[PDB]
């Protein structure tokens, strides 16, 4: 029950379907994104980044949340295709100017008080 | 009352001065350090104590509306003087 | 139309918050204590949620 | 009471109350509440499913003729189960009147788009999507309007920090503007101003 | 300005002379006046059209 | 008539101290008007007025050629005007400091300073508070 | 109550038609515009000879900030922190402690002039007329750091501009 | 640690890293990257400059408010060096010119200046000194550049025993002379190579790798008296290297052999330029000389740095040298060149 | 030395030419653009100093950042700054450009244009008066007069 209203999908199957269509679109767009923006990354790098972005939300089990995520991904794809985004906006996905933050206990204890 | 630290840097009225091993002094190389030479504590210490023949005096800092809020100072203690909490002026009754 | 979602509510993936500020943060839900310098009790009516205190340091310039 | 107090107008109050009763009688399916403020403002709290009908009625009925959409925004109240409150402000030039329509939604419930009823709503709805994250169904072109490209999160939400999470600076090594986790030379000083003494007895709540 | 020192600040002479005026000046310039709960939409005819505040 | 305008110009060039003064004022201020000397500044500036000009052009200053330490024959700026002549020049008052001198205080600067940005006398910010937390000083003697 | 701006019809008599034809063929209104520009050419320009001439100002003008003193040389500021609380841009930072003589005085008073909106609220909220906005406006710098004023800089500004600040306050304190 | 010099924050722009660095030669190719990497962590950087302040403008946005201080200095004056190194705990030396000027020879910029810097820093109490020499530095090298480099390295080691000496090899980047030098020879029409470049082996290193190595050596407690060699992960012949450079830039490669005396004559002819010379005899000598192999010296891997191959960063330098026809071509379209590794 | 005199005279001539003809790019962001317009108004008439607006960045010498620089816009400002041929100068006008001003603690505001481009002159105010911006422009002219490029080129 829980008395909820859908956005686009009634269950997990249609949500996974829309996810697959969005992944297809991003996969096809990646080489054009590399060509037009004159990025120094390879097509493999962009496709791996797209795969990682999709995998970051693999734990979602709510069709409404998945529908909203697909809507946001379509928004981002439309932003990229129309070249509304700039090279900085595209390259922000990679964090090349961020020092790697360590994850083990000893380094965190050394650097500062944050966990 | 300006005075210099053992490093040669002037000490501000707040009493701050960079330590000998402090790297921040490098910000003053080929430039200067802004120090105000008119120390308010000394300048208010030079003011004479006013003598008034009443137990309670009123102070507004002078200028009427151009001073500080008007306050009333009690002058019963003959061991000390009545000091305004806004302007720092001192008042006392004719003693001895 | 109703689709009968059976899972617990979770909107973390949609808020845009970095994961570091989701897993490592601890919030406090409490009724704020009355300030002891005053006898008023109007500030002890609603509940407050606030995050844990993190590091604050001194700016090298202007302190 | 004369010089420094705002004068009252009970005639407009009566007119607004009568028209609120009129609208409530005509549309019992959606209207949940009607209120008239002390400063002569009419508010109608309705059900979300009646967003499209009610507005259309208010736009097309001969006795309503609310042909102008002055404003459309959202209010975030985290203490409510339905976190977002959608507000429509309508102006009627024929009768020289103003009305307010209020409805509610949450993060995962879409709201029917009223672009068909009012063409002015389009950008407004985009803003509500951009600033609060409320999805509008059957919107002709829904996307961000005010925020930066690729910006994550909805800033006007209450749990969003004032300074955000990222900041921009130019980097010479990569020769471009990059975004990094936010750092402040001086932290924003939070002030606690609410006096511990109640100011308005007329708004005192029951002690639960 | 409205002759209500709980909304509008008093004159500087009154603030430096009267206790009530000083207290009201302090509270208004530190915390400010409290506004009763409520929502309003006020619109004016600005030179560019209708300018409104909700 | 035009002849009277030429005569006015000839009087203008004559009234600036000759041809050399006329050329100096023309190359220093790009203006050759003659007005009544309101006063002279302690740092060398001269202040003139002419109420027959329209508002804004009725008061002006010829800056000094020698400020505190720098040559101001060509390098001049509006920051070299002392506060009293600053008040008079910007039409904040009608009374010049010569006829309405400001109140004298022992803490007011007796020597005006211009904008010292980009100069070894520029302002460098720093913290005016003292050290907050004092660390423990270990003893200087051995423990064993 | 309203009027029309473009609800005028032209006369269709032969004379008016000839006048409009002459207007079209001989460009009368273009000559009118040329004459207007020529008339403006012979007027006196409104330009002033900066920096030798300055635009008018008022005693209410808000410019560079300054900290004032009493005629005895004692600082007016008592560290009440009203200006810090009323500052819309949070540009004021104040730290205070009892002085050596027990006076309530500041130890830190910073104004971030790159944060300040120059609204003048601080000098309205001050109960002792300690912080004021002076008449100076020509204080542009070459570096960002020079616009972060500490207590020493503001005290120097007050000592430098008191002669004009006192006169400006004297001419306007009755409006406050 | 002199409490004010204790690290604080998250290592961002507004953080405190505890590093006070005097970076001599910060207005050069390596200097801008070093200053950027230092100011990223919230360090205090002191930049001594002898050029126009305009030429230092690009260094301004690299730090927070008050974290970069620009100070005038003179190479032949030791009092100025003292003045700029009084309050620093790290002093980095990047001073060096590829050519000779009428006021400064190779010995002046590679022997006298580094020795004076080291002596003054040792007198002033600077904790760490980083010195930069060349990998191919040799006392009996045919090029006076490397002879001066070796003599200055010995002088720096003598004056500052705990100095960390870093020996990179043919740093390549956006503002390099290495890749741009080969790419600009397209204007003449033919590429002159001694022995057709078949007898030279090069191991270029990325600029970001060198800057990160310098930073890590500053933060490494055991790299005090060590000597490092910064080299790339691959070794190429000069012919194959120039071929790949021209292929990435999509320019027709027309190599021809030029004898040693002819190339020396060309270098001497170009040396009379009062401005920055296009090439010199010493540059010709250094170009056609194989990079040394020093397996006994620590490398970038011992500092936690993984060397960036030229194949992933060549396009970011060589896209500027293309025409409009090939401007948008991807990086993986060039078929990386052959490497002589062991 | 004769050569030192020659290079000093040439440097003076070049500095005079560059400071006498300053062409700011026609570029405004917020409220401060109104005061820039008033500086271009007849009362102040920046054109009498040799200062004219030009739309194309390739024909511009100075960039006057007059207004808030937002996150969405900073790449565009950097792009139009990079397309200015050298020598080029940047004048920061108003609190918003200098350090963020009223919107310093905002999620979408760059806390100072100096994070994106190097700044030569900072003009304080909110907004600075047209007189203040004129003072900043004249200070920039003096700073250009202080430049000596050929001198350091000779001493090299
Ligand atoms: C990145 O650094 C570098 C520079 O800085 C930007 C340079 O300028 C530079 C030298 C610049 C060259 C391109 C100069 C080449 C000279 C011209 C392009 C024309 C040369 C051809 C003839 C002189 C013209 C007539 C043709 C004859 C054969 C007759 C080099 C090599 C360099 O590497
Ligand atoms: C055949 C010729 C071929 C080449 C021709 C090239 C062009 C000819 C050279 C042009 C000469 C004119 C320049 C002189 C103008 C100087 C004006 C003077 O006032 O400037 C002063 C100082 O002048 C400069 O310091 C020096 C300028 C020139 C000095 C040397 C130039 C000598 C000419 C050499 C030409 C050789 C050409 C070589 C190539 C063939 C300071 O003024 P400034 O502060 O700004 O303005 C302040 C405004 N105030 C007063 C209202 C406040
Ligand atoms: N491929 C490479 O880059 C090779 C670099 N080398 C070493 O790396 C260091 C830096 O390299 P790189 O950035 O390419 O060199 P650059 O030519 O780009 O700049 C070096 C710096 O040294 C300064 N400088 C040079 N001579 C003097 C002098 N007589 N007095 C004062 N300052 C001077 C320059 O300042 P100014 O602009 O004012 O003249 C310049 O900023 C150098 O020490 C070099 O020897 C190591 C191997 C590889
Ligand atoms: C060219 C001279 C005569 C004046 C006019 C002018 C400038 C400088 C800049 C601009 C400009 O006009 C255009 C068009 O009108 C506005 C109106 C604006 O706000 C009302 C606004 O704010 C950014 C910007 C602009 C343009 C722009 O920036 O000097
Ligand atoms: S003028 Fe306004 S913004 Fe500036 S310091 Fe005063 S109160 Fe703050
Ligand atoms: S309001 Fe006036 S007295 Fe109070 S802290 Fe500010 S400057 Fe000082
Ligand atoms: S500094 Fe003030 S006037 Fe200028 S753009 Fe910002 S808010 Fe507007
Ligand atoms: Zn008093």
PDB file of N, CA, C and O in Angstrom, chain B residues 4-44:
ATOM      1  N   UNK B   4      58.822  49.896  21.358  1.00  0.00           N
ATOM      2  CA  UNK B   4      59.218  48.889  20.388  1.00  0.00           C
ATOM      3  C   UNK B   4      59.567  47.573  21.069  1.00  0.00           C
ATOM      4  O   UNK B   4      60.106  47.542  22.179  1.00  0.00           O
ATOM      5  N   UNK B   5      59.250  46.480  20.385  1.00  0.00           N
ATOM      6  CA  UNK B   5      59.602  45.144  20.829  1.00  0.00           C
ATOM      7  C   UNK B   5      61.095  44.901  20.630  1.00  0.00           C
ATOM      8  O   UNK B   5      61.759  45.638  19.895  1.00  0.00           O
ATOM      9  N   UNK B   6      61.657  43.880  21.287  1.00  0.00           N
ATOM     10  CA  UNK B   6      63.083  43.573  21.081  1.00  0.00           C
ATOM     11  C   UNK B   6      63.447  43.297  19.631  1.00  0.00           C
ATOM     12  O   UNK B   6      64.628  43.413  19.278  1.00  0.00           O
ATOM     13  N   UNK B   7      62.481  42.944  18.787  1.00  0.00           N
ATOM     14  CA  UNK B   7      62.707  42.796  17.356  1.00  0.00           C
ATOM     15  C   UNK B   7      62.806  44.143  16.649  1.00  0.00           C
ATOM     16  O   UNK B   7      63.373  44.219  15.553  1.00  0.00           O
ATOM     17  N   UNK B   8      62.318  45.214  17.272  1.00  0.00           N
ATOM     18  CA  UNK B   8      62.279  46.520  16.653  1.00  0.00           C
ATOM     19  C   UNK B   8      60.924  46.936  16.124  1.00  0.00           C
ATOM     20  O   UNK B   8      60.782  48.076  15.664  1.00  0.00           O
ATOM     21  N   UNK B   9      59.929  46.057  16.175  1.00  0.00           N
ATOM     22  CA  UNK B   9      58.581  46.377  15.730  1.00  0.00           C
ATOM     23  C   UNK B   9      57.852  47.187  16.794  1.00  0.00           C
ATOM     24  O   UNK B   9      57.991  46.928  17.993  1.00  0.00           O
ATOM     25  N   UNK B  10      57.076  48.171  16.349  1.00  0.00           N
ATOM     26  CA  UNK B  10      56.281  48.968  17.270  1.00  0.00           C
ATOM     27  C   UNK B  10      55.159  48.128  17.867  1.00  0.00           C
ATOM     28  O   UNK B  10      54.593  47.255  17.203  1.00  0.00           O
ATOM     29  N   UNK B  11      54.837  48.398  19.129  1.00  0.00           N
ATOM     30  CA  UNK B  11      53.777  47.696  19.841  1.00  0.00           C
ATOM     31  C   UNK B  11      52.533  48.573  19.837  1.00  0.00           C
ATOM     32  O   UNK B  11      52.577  49.729  20.276  1.00  0.00           O
ATOM     33  N   UNK B  12      51.427  48.025  19.345  1.00  0.00           N
ATOM     34  CA  UNK B  12      50.186  48.773  19.244  1.00  0.00           C
ATOM     35  C   UNK B  12      49.557  48.955  20.623  1.00  0.00           C
ATOM     36  O   UNK B  12      49.969  48.345  21.614  1.00  0.00           O
ATOM     37  N   UNK B  13      48.541  49.821  20.681  1.00  0.00           N
ATOM     38  CA  UNK B  13      47.864  50.084  21.947  1.00  0.00           C
ATOM     39  C   UNK B  13      47.176  48.837  22.484  1.00  0.00           C
ATOM     40  O   UNK B  13      46.954  48.724  23.695  1.00  0.00           O
ATOM     41  N   UNK B  14      46.830  47.896  21.605  1.00  0.00           N
ATOM     42  CA  UNK B  14      46.268  46.630  22.060  1.00  0.00           C
ATOM     43  C   UNK B  14      47.336  45.737  22.676  1.00  0.00           C
ATOM     44  O   UNK B  14      47.010  44.740  23.331  1.00  0.00           O
ATOM     45  N   UNK B  15      48.607  46.073  22.478  1.00  0.00           N
ATOM     46  CA  UNK B  15      49.701  45.305  23.029  1.00  0.00           C
ATOM     47  C   UNK B  15      50.197  44.167  22.168  1.00  0.00           C
ATOM     48  O   UNK B  15      50.946  43.320  22.667  1.00  0.00           O
ATOM     49  N   UNK B  16      49.808  44.118  20.896  1.00  0.00           N
ATOM     50  CA  UNK B  16      50.173  43.014  20.021  1.00  0.00           C
ATOM     51  C   UNK B  16      51.492  43.316  19.321  1.00  0.00           C
ATOM     52  O   UNK B  16      51.767  44.467  18.963  1.00  0.00           O
ATOM     53  N   UNK B  17      52.316  42.284  19.162  1.00  0.00           N
ATOM     54  CA  UNK B  17      53.565  42.367  18.422  1.00  0.00           C
ATOM     55  C   UNK B  17      53.988  40.960  18.033  1.00  0.00           C
ATOM     56  O   UNK B  17      53.922  40.039  18.852  1.00  0.00           O
ATOM     57  N   UNK B  18      54.417  40.798  16.784  1.00  0.00           N
ATOM     58  CA  UNK B  18      54.797  39.480  16.297  1.00  0.00           C
ATOM     59  C   UNK B  18      56.051  38.985  17.007  1.00  0.00           C
ATOM     60  O   UNK B  18      56.995  39.744  17.244  1.00  0.00           O
ATOM     61  N   UNK B  19      56.055  37.698  17.343  1.00  0.00           N
ATOM     62  CA  UNK B  19      57.173  37.102  18.055  1.00  0.00           C
ATOM     63  C   UNK B  19      58.410  37.036  17.163  1.00  0.00           C
ATOM     64  O   UNK B  19      58.355  37.272  15.953  1.00  0.00           O
ATOM     65  N   UNK B  20      59.547  36.713  17.787  1.00  0.00           N
ATOM     66  CA  UNK B  20      60.808  36.659  17.054  1.00  0.00           C
ATOM     67  C   UNK B  20      60.781  35.587  15.973  1.00  0.00           C
ATOM     68  O   UNK B  20      61.234  35.820  14.845  1.00  0.00           O
ATOM     69  N   UNK B  21      60.256  34.411  16.292  1.00  0.00           N
ATOM     70  CA  UNK B  21      60.188  33.317  15.350  1.00  0.00           C
ATOM     71  C   UNK B  21      58.962  33.301  14.467  1.00  0.00           C
ATOM     72  O   UNK B  21      58.779  32.348  13.702  1.00  0.00           O
ATOM     73  N   UNK B  22      58.109  34.318  14.551  1.00  0.00           N
ATOM     74  CA  UNK B  22      56.877  34.364  13.775  1.00  0.00           C
ATOM     75  C   UNK B  22      57.208  34.684  12.323  1.00  0.00           C
ATOM     76  O   UNK B  22      57.952  35.629  12.046  1.00  0.00           O
ATOM     77  N   UNK B  23      56.665  33.888  11.400  1.00  0.00           N
ATOM     78  CA  UNK B  23      56.892  34.141   9.982  1.00  0.00           C
ATOM     79  C   UNK B  23      56.046  35.294   9.458  1.00  0.00           C
ATOM     80  O   UNK B  23      56.393  35.880   8.427  1.00  0.00           O
ATOM     81  N   UNK B  24      54.958  35.640  10.151  1.00  0.00           N
ATOM     82  CA  UNK B  24      54.043  36.665   9.660  1.00  0.00           C
ATOM     83  C   UNK B  24      54.710  38.026   9.517  1.00  0.00           C
ATOM     84  O   UNK B  24      54.220  38.865   8.752  1.00  0.00           O
ATOM     85  N   UNK B  25      55.831  38.255  10.207  1.00  0.00           N
ATOM     86  CA  UNK B  25      56.565  39.504  10.040  1.00  0.00           C
ATOM     87  C   UNK B  25      57.016  39.713   8.603  1.00  0.00           C
ATOM     88  O   UNK B  25      57.277  40.855   8.205  1.00  0.00           O
ATOM     89  N   UNK B  26      57.102  38.640   7.810  1.00  0.00           N
ATOM     90  CA  UNK B  26      57.477  38.771   6.409  1.00  0.00           C
ATOM     91  C   UNK B  26      56.479  39.625   5.641  1.00  0.00           C
ATOM     92  O   UNK B  26      56.814  40.163   4.581  1.00  0.00           O
ATOM     93  N   UNK B  27      55.253  39.776   6.153  1.00  0.00           N
ATOM     94  CA  UNK B  27      54.286  40.628   5.470  1.00  0.00           C
ATOM     95  C   UNK B  27      54.635  42.106   5.591  1.00  0.00           C
ATOM     96  O   UNK B  27      54.059  42.925   4.867  1.00  0.00           O
ATOM     97  N   UNK B  28      55.562  42.466   6.479  1.00  0.00           N
ATOM     98  CA  UNK B  28      55.976  43.851   6.649  1.00  0.00           C
ATOM     99  C   UNK B  28      57.281  44.185   5.938  1.00  0.00           C
ATOM    100  O   UNK B  28      57.694  45.349   5.955  1.00  0.00           O
ATOM    101  N   UNK B  29      57.939  43.203   5.324  1.00  0.00           N
ATOM    102  CA  UNK B  29      59.180  43.464   4.608  1.00  0.00           C
ATOM    103  C   UNK B  29      58.912  44.298   3.363  1.00  0.00           C
ATOM    104  O   UNK B  29      57.967  44.037   2.613  1.00  0.00           O
ATOM    105  N   UNK B  30      59.755  45.308   3.145  1.00  0.00           N
ATOM    106  CA  UNK B  30      59.616  46.306   2.086  1.00  0.00           C
ATOM    107  C   UNK B  30      58.315  47.090   2.195  1.00  0.00           C
ATOM    108  O   UNK B  30      57.929  47.774   1.239  1.00  0.00           O
ATOM    109  N   UNK B  31      57.626  47.001   3.326  1.00  0.00           N
ATOM    110  CA  UNK B  31      56.417  47.773   3.586  1.00  0.00           C
ATOM    111  C   UNK B  31      56.482  48.229   5.039  1.00  0.00           C
ATOM    112  O   UNK B  31      57.528  48.147   5.693  1.00  0.00           O
ATOM    113  N   UNK B  32      55.362  48.715   5.565  1.00  0.00           N
ATOM    114  CA  UNK B  32      55.310  49.249   6.917  1.00  0.00           C
ATOM    115  C   UNK B  32      54.198  48.564   7.700  1.00  0.00           C
ATOM    116  O   UNK B  32      53.366  47.841   7.147  1.00  0.00           O
ATOM    117  N   UNK B  33      54.196  48.807   9.007  1.00  0.00           N
ATOM    118  CA  UNK B  33      53.176  48.294   9.913  1.00  0.00           C
ATOM    119  C   UNK B  33      52.331  49.464  10.399  1.00  0.00           C
ATOM    120  O   UNK B  33      52.871  50.461  10.890  1.00  0.00           O
ATOM    121  N   UNK B  34      51.014  49.342  10.258  1.00  0.00           N
ATOM    122  CA  UNK B  34      50.111  50.419  10.639  1.00  0.00           C
ATOM    123  C   UNK B  34      49.937  50.444  12.152  1.00  0.00           C
ATOM    124  O   UNK B  34      49.342  49.529  12.730  1.00  0.00           O
ATOM    125  N   UNK B  35      50.458  51.487  12.792  1.00  0.00           N
ATOM    126  CA  UNK B  35      50.346  51.671  14.233  1.00  0.00           C
ATOM    127  C   UNK B  35      49.832  53.078  14.498  1.00  0.00           C
ATOM    128  O   UNK B  35      50.404  54.055  13.999  1.00  0.00           O
ATOM    129  N   UNK B  36      48.759  53.181  15.276  1.00  0.00           N
ATOM    130  CA  UNK B  36      48.236  54.479  15.679  1.00  0.00           C
ATOM    131  C   UNK B  36      49.006  54.983  16.893  1.00  0.00           C
ATOM    132  O   UNK B  36      49.141  54.272  17.893  1.00  0.00           O
ATOM    133  N   UNK B  37      49.512  56.212  16.803  1.00  0.00           N
ATOM    134  CA  UNK B  37      50.400  56.753  17.820  1.00  0.00           C
ATOM    135  C   UNK B  37      49.671  57.425  18.975  1.00  0.00           C
ATOM    136  O   UNK B  37      50.300  57.708  20.000  1.00  0.00           O
ATOM    137  N   UNK B  38      48.371  57.688  18.845  1.00  0.00           N
ATOM    138  CA  UNK B  38      47.604  58.349  19.901  1.00  0.00           C
ATOM    139  C   UNK B  38      46.944  57.280  20.761  1.00  0.00           C
ATOM    140  O   UNK B  38      45.868  56.773  20.446  1.00  0.00           O
ATOM    141  N   UNK B  39      47.601  56.935  21.865  1.00  0.00           N
ATOM    142  CA  UNK B  39      47.075  55.936  22.787  1.00  0.00           C
ATOM    143  C   UNK B  39      45.982  56.568  23.640  1.00  0.00           C
ATOM    144  O   UNK B  39      46.220  57.570  24.322  1.00  0.00           O
ATOM    145  N   UNK B  40      44.785  55.981  23.602  1.00  0.00           N
ATOM    146  CA  UNK B  40      43.646  56.578  24.291  1.00  0.00           C
ATOM    147  C   UNK B  40      43.801  56.504  25.805  1.00  0.00           C
ATOM    148  O   UNK B  40      43.340  57.398  26.524  1.00  0.00           O
ATOM    149  N   UNK B  41      44.437  55.444  26.309  1.00  0.00           N
ATOM    150  CA  UNK B  41      44.557  55.273  27.754  1.00  0.00           C
ATOM    151  C   UNK B  41      45.415  56.380  28.361  1.00  0.00           C
ATOM    152  O   UNK B  41      45.046  56.985  29.375  1.00  0.00           O
ATOM    153  N   UNK B  42      46.553  56.692  27.735  1.00  0.00           N
ATOM    154  CA  UNK B  42      47.374  57.798  28.216  1.00  0.00           C
ATOM    155  C   UNK B  42      46.647  59.132  28.090  1.00  0.00           C
ATOM    156  O   UNK B  42      46.683  59.953  29.015  1.00  0.00           O
ATOM    157  N   UNK B  43      45.973  59.354  26.959  1.00  0.00           N
ATOM    158  CA  UNK B  43      45.299  60.626  26.725  1.00  0.00           C
ATOM    159  C   UNK B  43      44.184  60.860  27.737  1.00  0.00           C
ATOM    160  O   UNK B  43      43.934  62.002  28.139  1.00  0.00           O
ATOM    161  N   UNK B  44      43.500  59.795  28.162  1.00  0.00           N
ATOM    162  CA  UNK B  44      42.498  59.948  29.207  1.00  0.00           C
ATOM    163  C   UNK B  44      43.146  60.012  30.584  1.00  0.00           C
ATOM    164  O   UNK B  44      42.552  60.560  31.519  1.00  0.00           O
TER     165      UNK B  44
END
